[PDB]
C-alpha cells in the first residue's frame, strides 16, 4: 500500500535493538517497534 | 569540607615540559569530573583537557592534543598533569577543578566546579 | 503477572494448544457417549410403549 | 563491591527478609545487559519472590 522509512542514528551495541520483541533503552524510550511488523532494518557503519 | 590543592608556582624557560599536581581532600573521590583550565593574562579562560579517575580515560582540547598529558592517581586521590612544548604565550594561572556528580555515573549528570584551585 | 505480552504470547498459545485439545477431547466423548444413551433412550422407549 | 568472585569460585550472596525496589536497579543506566529469562524486566517490580 505504502511504504514508510524511519531513519536515525544509534550505538553500535544498540543496533540488535532494533527489531521485535527486543529491550533496552533505545527499544522502551525511544523507537519502539511492534511485534507484528513487516518490514526491513537496514544498519550500515557511519563512523567516517 | 572537601576541597583541591596543588603544588606552588614554576618558571620553566621555554621548550620545557611542566608537571603540576592536584591533591583531593575529603569526600568519595575518583567520582569527581576533574578539569583542567586556564586564563591568559588579560584574555578569558580557556580549556585544554579534563579526566575522570574512575573511567581512567582523559579528554583533551584540539589546540592542546598531543601536548599535554593528563592522569588521575587513585592511590593518592590525585590528579597529575604534564604539559610539554611550553612557548612564550603558553604562560598563564593553571586551575584544577572538579565537578560533583549523581547519577548513574557513567552518563553525564553533574553539579557545577563549586570547587577551584588556588593557581599554579 | 510474569512475562510481558511479546513471550506472553508464546506462553499462552501453548496452553491455548493444550486446553483447546483438552476440551475438543471432552466434547467427543460427551457425543460419543451421547450417542450410546440416545440409543438406550430408544430402547427405554420403545420398550416403554 | 570490589571483590567480585573468579568464575571457576564464584560467589553466592543470598538476599531474604526485604522490600527489593528493583526501579533503581532497572531504571539504572549503569548496565549494558539486562536480559531477563522466565519473567520480564519491566514487571518485576510488581512480583514477590
Known amino acids: 500500500t505504502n511504504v514508510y522509512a524511519d531513519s536515525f542514528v544509534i550505538r553500535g551495541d544498540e543496533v540488535r535493538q532494533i527489531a521485535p520483541g527486543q529491550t533496552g533503552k533505545i527499544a522502551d524510550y525511544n523507537y519502539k517497534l511492534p511485534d507484528d511488523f513487516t518490514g526491513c532494518v537496514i544498519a550500515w557503519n557511519s563512523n567516517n | 569540607q572537601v576541597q583541591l590543592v596543588q603544588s606552588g608556582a614554576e618558571v620553566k624557560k621555554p621548550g620545557s615540559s611542566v608537571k603540576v599536581s592536584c591533591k583531593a581532600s575529603?569526600?568519595?573521590?575518583?567520582?569527581?569530573?576533574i578539569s583542567w583550565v586556564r586564563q591568559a593574562p588579560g584574555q578569558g579562560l580557556e580549556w585544554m583537557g579534563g579526566i575522570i579517575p574512575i573511567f581512567g580515560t582523559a579528554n583533551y582540547a584540539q589546540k592542546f592534543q598531543g601536548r599535554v598529558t593528563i592522569t588521575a592517581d587513585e592511590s593518592t586521590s590525585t590528579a597529575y598533569m604534564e604539559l610539554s612544548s611550553l612557548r612564550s604565550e603558553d604562560t598563564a594561572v593553571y586551575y584544577c577543578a572538579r565537578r560533583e556528580a549523581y547519577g548513574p555515573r557513567d552518563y553525564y549528570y553533574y553539579y557545577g566546579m563549586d570547587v577551584w584551585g588556588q593557581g599554579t | 503477572s510474569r512475562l510481558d505480552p511479546p513471550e506472553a504470547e508464546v506462553q499462552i498459545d501453548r496452553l491455548i494448544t493444550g486446553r483447546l485439545q483438552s476440551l475438543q477431547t471432552y466434547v467427543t466423548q460427551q457425543l460419543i457417549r451421547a450417542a450410546e444413551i440416545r440409543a438406550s433412550a430408544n430402547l427405554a422407549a420403545t420398550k416403554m410403549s | 563491591a570490589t571483590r567480585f568472585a573468579s568464575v571457576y569460585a564464584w560467589n553466592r550472596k543470598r538476599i531474604s527478609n526485604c522490600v527489593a525496589d528493583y526501579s533503581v536497579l532497572y531504571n539504572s543506566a549503569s548496565f549494558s545487559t539486562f536480559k531477563c529469562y522466565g519473567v520480564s524486566p519491566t514487571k518485576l517490580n510488581d512480583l514477590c519472590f
Open positions: 575529603g569526600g568519595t573521590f575518583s567520582s569527581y569530573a
